[PDB]
């Protein structure tokens, strides 16, 4: 497991360029935000509602805890 | 006889000129042969995209036939002289020189001017030469080495017409019309941009009338190139069912001008050259090649000085199997660093010496000396004498190679091409960070 017989490959053409020549940050934002956008919508439904409801959870627990504290009126 | 004496002694190379501009030039030493032959400044540089490759079916489809001498009937007045035929078109110089007897002088040029002015470009001459222009190109591909200097020039002369290949795309092989071709004679293969060459047994004075009286009706008395840039990059080729790894590393060095070619074929020169099958192996003195064979680290290596007139590549390329790229890397990257940041008196004094032998073996035989004269008038502007290139390796030292090598070689983003099993190739990060070496 070290360079020169990871595996085989062939008729593969890669080029590249220096970091001397050419920009680190090239429009970092005229598509960094686009990309952000984008992959935030493919996440979003996958991430977001077991998180939502732990909120709801969390706020409901809190709340009933501060009821169940108050007096019963009796 | 004590060299210099022989070096003033070596006949000079006059030049006159037409006032159509052809540059006329000869040598005349002793001998009975003769190598004459015509350098047009044209080749792949100057083809724009659709034009690539144009220039080399114009040399193929020269030969074939002319006006005046319908077809396979030149072929006929070259063999039945013995005289020998040639042409090479490289990517800014063509040329076509034919070796003949010093008698066959007269009709040498005729054939010649033949050849340049007036082709025949016959249209089934076409037809036929593309199929063999598309099977060459296989056997191009074939062929490892050419198929690495090409990556390179693609890869460090990217987005100008330096990185075109001579031959051309294959694509643009089949189109390629007549018009095309004739358009290009045309606006390339004009006089001011021909150098009429003839060493051996050739005198000035007929050589000067023949050339007026066979190329006089040349166009008498527009696209000049533009200055190419580098491109730091590179291509590599992973195909790992090739036995060996060709690799090519160039950094941008001077060109035909820029008096520092002299140092740098010095440092080169201590780089030198080795393959599997060689001498002394692990007792050479240059350290890369005495590793290489003690290490049987490579099956080649070869320093390259390949300079155009407005840049140029200069660097070395390596063949050696898939587990030895890396090693191979390091090595001569250090020896390159080496020469940077101490050169040494006794190395600049080795390479001084392999690089003066080299100019006076290369300037042997009738062939070698026209290519040499119509070369020197094409890119320097003169022949420039032996004594003169004697002195520019006298006036090398230690310290100049040092400050010319880290001009050109310290710090510098180089253009790599790698074909074959070349997956342990270092990463352009890592080939660029050997190129600074941290102690220094
Ligand atoms: C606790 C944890 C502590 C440690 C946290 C960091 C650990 C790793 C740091 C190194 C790392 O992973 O670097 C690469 C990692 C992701 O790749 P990148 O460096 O942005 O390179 C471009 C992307 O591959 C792809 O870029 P893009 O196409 O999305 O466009 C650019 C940009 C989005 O464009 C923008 O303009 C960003 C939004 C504004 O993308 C980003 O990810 C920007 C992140 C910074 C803002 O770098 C970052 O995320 C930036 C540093 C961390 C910021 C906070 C992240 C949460
Ligand atoms: C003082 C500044 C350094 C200096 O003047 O010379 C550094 C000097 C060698 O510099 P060089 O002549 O450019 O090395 C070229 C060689 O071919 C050796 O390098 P290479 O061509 O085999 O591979 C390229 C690269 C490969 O990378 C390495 O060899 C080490 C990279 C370490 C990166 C950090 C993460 C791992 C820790 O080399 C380096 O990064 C520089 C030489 C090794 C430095 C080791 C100490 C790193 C401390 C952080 O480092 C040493 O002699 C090591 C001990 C002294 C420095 C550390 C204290
Ligand atoms: C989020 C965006 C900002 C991230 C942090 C930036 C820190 C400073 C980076 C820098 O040195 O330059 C950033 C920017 C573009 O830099 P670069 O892509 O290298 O191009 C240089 C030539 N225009 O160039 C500049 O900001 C101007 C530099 C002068
Ligand atoms: C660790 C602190 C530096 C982190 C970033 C740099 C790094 O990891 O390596 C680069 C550094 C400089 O040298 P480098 O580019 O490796 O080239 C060596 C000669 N070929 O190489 C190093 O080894 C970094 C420390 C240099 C002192």
Redesign the pocket.
């Known amino acids: 497991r070290e360079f020169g017989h990871l595996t085989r490959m062939r008729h593969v053409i890669t080029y590249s360029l220096s970091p001397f020549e050419q920009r680190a940050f090239p429009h970092?934002?005229t598509?960094?935000?686009p990309?952000?956008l984008r992959?935030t919508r493919a996440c979003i439904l996958r991430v977001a509602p077991p998180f939502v409801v732990f909120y709801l959870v969390y706020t409901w627990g809190t709340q009933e805890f501060e009821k169940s504290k108050r007096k019963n009126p009796a | 006889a004590t060299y210099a004496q022989a070096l003033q002694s070596v006949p000079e190379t006059q030049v006159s000129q037409l006032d159509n501009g052809l540059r006329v030039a000869s040598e005349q030493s002793s001998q009975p042969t003769c190598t004459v032959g015509v350098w047009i400044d044209a080749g792949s540089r100057y083809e724009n995209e659709k034009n690539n490759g144009a220039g080399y079916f114009v040399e193929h489809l020269a030969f074939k036939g002319t006006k005046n001498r319908p077809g396979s009937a030149l072929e006929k007045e070259v063999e039945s002289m013995g005289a020998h035929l040639n042409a090479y078109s490289t990517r800014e110089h063509t040329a076509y020189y034919i070796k003949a007897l010093s008698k066959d002088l007269p009709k040498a040029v005729e054939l010649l001017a033949d050849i340049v002015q007036n082709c025949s470009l016959e249209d089934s001459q076409i037809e036929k030469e593309r199929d063999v222009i598309l099977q060459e190109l296989q056997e191009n591909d074939s062929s490892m080495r050419d198929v690495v200097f090409d990556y390179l020039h693609a890869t460090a002369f990217q987005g100008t017409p330096l990185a075109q290949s001579v031959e051309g795309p294959s694509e643009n092989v089949r189109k390629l019309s007549r018009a095309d071709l004739t358009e290009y004679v045309s606006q390339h293969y004009k006089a001011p941009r021909m150098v009429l060459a003839a060493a051996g047994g050739v005198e000035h004075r007929q050589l000067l009338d023949l050339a007026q009286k066979h190329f006089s009706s040349l166009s008498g008395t527009v696209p000049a190139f533009t200055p190419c840039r580098f491109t730091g990059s590179e291509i590599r080729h992973r195909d790992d069912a090739l036995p060996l790894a060709h690799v090519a590393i160039a950094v941008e060095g001077p060109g035909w001008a820029n008096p520092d070619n002299v140092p740098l074929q010095v440092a080169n020169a201590i780089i030198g050259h080795y393959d599997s099958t060689y001498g002394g192996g692990t007792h050479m003195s240059s350290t890369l090649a005495s590793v290489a064979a003690t290490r049987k680290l490579c099956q080649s290596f070869q320093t390259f000085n390949i300079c155009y007139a407005e840049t140029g590549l200069l660097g070395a390329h390596f063949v050696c199997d898939n587990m030895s790229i890396d090693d191979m890397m390091f090595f001569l990257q250090g020896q390159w660093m080496r020469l940077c940041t101490s050169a040494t008196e006794s190395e600049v004094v080795r390479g001084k010496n392999i690089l003066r032998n080299a100019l006076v073996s290369h300037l042997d035989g009738t062939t070698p000396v026209c290519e040499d004269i119509g070369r020197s008038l094409l890119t320097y502007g003169r022949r420039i004498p032996l004594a003169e290139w004697e002195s520019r390796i006298a006036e090398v030292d230690a310290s100049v190679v040092r400050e010319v090598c880290s001009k050109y070689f310290y710090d510098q983003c180089p253009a790599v091409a790698g074909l074959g099993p070349i997956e342990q190739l270092p990463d352009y990060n890592r080939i660029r960070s050997g190129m600074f070496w941290l102690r220094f």
Do not use: M, Q, T
């Open positions: 970092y934002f598509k960094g935000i990309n952000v992959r």
